[PDB]
Amino acid sequence: MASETFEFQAEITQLMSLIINTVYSNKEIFLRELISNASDALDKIRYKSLSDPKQLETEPDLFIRITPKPEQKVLEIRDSGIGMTKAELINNLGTIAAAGTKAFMEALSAGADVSMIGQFGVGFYSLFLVADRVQVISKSNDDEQYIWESNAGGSFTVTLDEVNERIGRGTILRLFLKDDQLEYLEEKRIKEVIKRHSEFVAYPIQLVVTKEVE
Ligand SMILES: COC1=C2C[C@@H](C)C[C@H](OC)[C@H](O)[C@@H](C)/C=C(\C)[C@H](OC(N)=O)[C@@H](OC)/C=C\C=C(/C)C(=O)NC(=CC1=O)C2=O
């Protein structure tokens, strides 16, 4: 319940500020980036399990799941991958990405397409193309479930999770969509973005759709 507050390394702050404010036209690339991250996390729990099969037991099903939450203007991207500990959330989302953000920012200033962001290993931050706030909710086998929260400002919070559904293992990216990016809540649009940029994914991609019965 009591949150802890941390400062972003200056370079990450710089990268986020640029992305949340950019008028780049191909914002849909965020979904490919987050699906790729989900796939990586799943690769890692699968590989870890080769020599430690009990690691799968916390969530035997390996999947990527996409859930639009229209009333809240939220889009969730979930995986049952390896997940992240508290220390991992703090270090990797707040500091380790710093250098990668610098080289990528230099490439941007030179004319690189924002879509290159994954090749510089900082594609997580592409979520700010469509969202002005994010909660990363994560459960590693090695720690409790935690919430990392950022609004692209210079600081982020980490809080022990006593408010969200239990995930057996893995991560939820909960995107709070900008008012002009609500198209990414629609089933039709989501399918077309997946089919276009994520053709070769080794894991099931599940879409959770809410429909009124008549
Ligand atoms: C190859 O590893 C990747 C790294 C190196 C490093 C951070 C990996 C991380 O180390 C603790 C875990 O091993 C890994 C399993 C966790 C994820 C991929 C998370 O995604 C999900 N769904 O768990 C991702 O998002 C919340 C966290 C950070 C992503 C960043 C900063 C990024 O921008 N791009 C990156 C994409 C990557 O694939 C990246 O830096």
From Swiss-Prot:
Changing T22I: Induces a 6-fold increase in ATPase activity and a reduced client protein activation activity, leading to growth defect at high temperatures. Molecular chaperone that promotes the maturation, structural maintenance and proper regulation of specific target proteins involved in cell cycle control and signal transduction. Undergoes a functional cycle that is linked to its ATPase activity. The nucleotide-free form of the dimer is found in an open conformation in which the N-termini are not dimerized and the complex is ready for client protein binding. It comes from Saccharomyces cerevisiae (strain ATCC 204508 / S288c). The chain holds residues 1 to 214 of 709 of the full protein. The TPR repeat-binding motif mediates interaction with TPR repeat-containing proteins like the co-chaperones AHA1, CDC37, CNS1, CPR6, CPR7, HCH1, SBA1, SSE1 and STI1. CNS1, CPR6, CPR7 and STI1. Present with 444943 molecules/cell in log phase SD medium. Homodimer. Interacts with the co-chaperones AHA1, CDC37, CNS1, CPR6, CPR7, HCH1, SBA1, SSE1 and STI1. CNS1, CPR6, CPR7 and STI1. Interacts directly with the substrates GCN2, HAP1 and STE11. Belongs to the heat shock protein 90 family. Changing A107N: Induces a 6-fold increase in ATPase activity. Changing G170D: Induces a total loss of function at 34 degrees Celsius. Abolishes interaction with SBA1. Induction: Expressed constitutively and induced by high temperatures dependent on transcription factor HSF1. According to PubMed:2674684, it is constitutively expressed at low levels, however, due to the specificity of the antibody, this result is unsure. It is found in: Cytoplasm. Changing A41V: Causes a 98% reduction in ATPase activity and a reduced client protein activation activity, leading to growth defect at high temperatures. ATP binds at residues 33, 37, 79, 84, 92, 98-100, 119-124, 171. This is ATP-dependent molecular chaperone HSP82. Changing G81S: Reduces client protein activation activity, leading to growth defect at high temperatures.
